[PDB]
């Protein structure tokens, strides 16, 4: 319960940190030419390596 309260309190920070780092890695896979769909870009941007 205390961890869930802290994760809720700091959720905005953790989400900013997640979004800040999730797109910083060089993935050759998602180099602009072969990403045929907006959904694939959205899914990649929702993942952290």
């Amino acid at each position: 319960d205390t961890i869930n309260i802290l994760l809720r309190r700091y959720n905005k920070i953790l989400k900013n940190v997640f979004v800040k780092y999730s797109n910083t890695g060089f993935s050759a896979q998602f180099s602009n030419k072969n990403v045929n769909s907006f959904d694939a870009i959205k899914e990649h941007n929702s993942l952290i390596s």
């Binding site: 994760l7 953790l14 989400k15 997640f18 929702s46 993942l47 952290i48 390596s49």
Partner: peptide, 8 residues
């Protein structure tokens, strides 16, 4: 790769 829940 983690989703936001995996990152939490």
């Amino acid at each position: 790769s983690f989703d936001f829940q995996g990152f939490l």
